[PDB]
Design a protein around this ligand. Structure first.
Ligand SMILES: CC(C)=CCC/C(C)=C\CC/C(C)=C/COP(=O)(O)OP(=O)(O)O
Ligand SMILES: [Mg+2]
Ligand SMILES: [Mg+2]
Length: 482
């Protein structure tokens, strides 16, 4: 067949081979400068784990020369070795300033202590903010400001074993605060040993344990779009469904009790295609989870109602709930939210991904997948057309797309664009979709896989790197488009 189908086939073989007999696609996260630096500071201040501290130190220096990250993380690493268009901005300015001050690189924000108090949402955001407030209280010489409720938010960080909610950043920040408390120091020795035991072969500390639930769901979805899905989709559906949380949603990795809309939508889309009856109850519990989260403006948040609806989250929930005709009223209200928020140049937003193409792909699938007729058909078709025109206008000479219009191409950003474009008109020779496919064919590695700069962000906008996602998302693009 075509070079595209051959590329698709080699890739599917690789993705199938990487699924384990437990039905999971392992998705470890790479070392990150930020957490390595924090781990370095914590162990150093406690005069602990000299072996780990030297490895951490070599990793940080090696990475600064050869693959240095964003400037915030470099300045964090330098402190230890010695624009944002989003509703979260501000809280992030406070968070990132306090981190650098805690490490002695800048002054503590001269803000009222209530600045650090946040509504209940993401389980670990509360812990992170409380930890930073404690570090600022003690850093500025006002330890008596710390309330007993501030300390109590940090207690999960003193549990043995892997970090609570798989978040090394949250635990490290909490531990850096807790070591200032005599009441809590008896539990510290034991966790410092498990922390030191987390180093990766290259000597660094990853942001999170991994993203196996998200990655297995995306891979299962891609495999289920193939002409003949492999057999392993059933054990993958089983592995996801048995990990569902009591609220019916899904976290990003094994042992994440915090559900989120993005993970739940990928599990939901996947189970609807590969196991709608075998996993009928899991499917219905996931729709219930999404429906209970919906905001009154028609949109959907990431984690918790009452927090800002997001475009991509709202687009993802519209596609995921479209299958059942009984949610037409909620699905349509979601798609209208997407249309209302399209920007003047056809784009949408950056959030959990750092490229523009991610939100476009979500938006376009919601806009074209929910069947529609009449004036609302016209209105959605126009919105979708402007999103695909935006893609055509920012396509790079090699046929791919980067994180930003003037950025070098990468396979993941390109994969998102292809999914969107496969919903447009038929690939004409030398058309944008045709050229993006040619870009993906040419970037296939000899081992059948893809190496791509990462797109996942957390805390936004800091990138972290789960390499298994590159194969998964390119496969999802190739499956959608063929
Ligand atoms: C792709 C993904 C599944 C989308 C949902 C995001 C999340 C549930 C998974 C990404 C990994 C996670 C621990 C980042 C959240 O960081 P954070 O709490 O600090 O985020 P924030 O401060 O920017 O709000
Ligand atoms: Mg945060
Ligand atoms: Mg975090």
């Amino acid at each position: 067949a075509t070079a595209v189908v051959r590329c698709r086939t080699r890739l599917a073989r690789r993705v199938v081979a990487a699924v384990g007999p437990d039905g999971l696609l392992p998705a470890p996260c790479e070392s990150r400068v930020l957490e390595s630096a924090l781990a370095l500071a914590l162990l150093t201040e406690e005069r602990a784990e000299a072996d780990a501290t030297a490895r951490l130190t070599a990793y940080l220096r090696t990475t600064l020369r050869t693959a240095p990250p964003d400037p915030f993380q470099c300045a964090v690493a330098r402190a230890v070795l010695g624009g944002f268009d989003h509703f979260t901005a501000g809280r992030k300015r406070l968070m990132f300033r306090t981190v650098l001050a805690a490490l002695g690189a800048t002054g503590f924000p001269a803000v009222p202590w209530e600045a650090y108090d946040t509504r209940p949402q993401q389980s670990w955001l509360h812990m992170e903010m409380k930890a930073l407030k404690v570090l600022a209280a003690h850093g500025t010489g006002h330890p008596d400001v710390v309330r007993d409720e501030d300390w109590r938010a940090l207690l999960p960080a003193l549990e043995p074993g892997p970090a609570w909610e798989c978040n090394n950043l949250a635990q490290l920040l909490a531990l850096l605060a807790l070591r200032h408390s005599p009441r809590h120091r008896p539990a510290l020795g034991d966790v410092l040993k498990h922390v030191a035991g987390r180093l990766r072969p290259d000597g660094g500390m990853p942001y999170i344990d991994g993203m196996t639930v998200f990655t297995t769901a995306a891979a299962g979805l891609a495999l289920s779009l193939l002409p003949a899905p492999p057999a392993c989709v059933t054990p993958m559906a089983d592995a996801l469904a048995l990990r569902r949380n009591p609220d019916g949603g899904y976290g990003f990795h094994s042992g994440v009790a915090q559900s989120d809309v993005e993970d739940t939508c990928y599990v939901l889309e996947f189970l609807r295609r590969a196991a709608p009856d075998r996993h009928r109850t899991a499917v219905a519990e996931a729709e219930g989870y999404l429906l209970a989260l919906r905001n009154p403006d028609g949109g959907f948040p990431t984690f918790a109602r009452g927090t800002s609806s997001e475009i991509a989250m709202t687009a993802a929930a519209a596609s995921a709930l479209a299958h059942d005709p009984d949610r037409r009223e909620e699905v349509d209200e979601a798609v209208r939210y997407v249309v209302r928020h399209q920007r003047p140049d056809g784009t949408f937003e950056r959030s959990w991904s750092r490229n523009a193409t991610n939100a476009v792909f979500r938006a376009v699938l919601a806009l074209t997948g929910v069947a529609a007729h009449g004036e609302e058909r016209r209105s959605r078709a126009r919105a979708a057309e402007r999103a695909l025109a935006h893609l055509a206008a920012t396509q790079n000479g090699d046929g791919g797309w980067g994180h930003a219009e003037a950025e070098p191409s990468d396979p993941i950003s390109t994969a998102y664009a292809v999914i969107a474009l496969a919903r447009g008109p038929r690939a004409r020779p030398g058309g944008p979709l045709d050229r993006a496919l040619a870009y993906l064919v040419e970037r296939q590695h000899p081992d059948g896989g893809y190496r791509s700069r990462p797109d996942q962000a957390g805390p936004r906008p800091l990138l972290y790197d789960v390499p298994a996602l590159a194969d998964v998302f390119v496969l999802l693009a190739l499956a959608h488009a063929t």
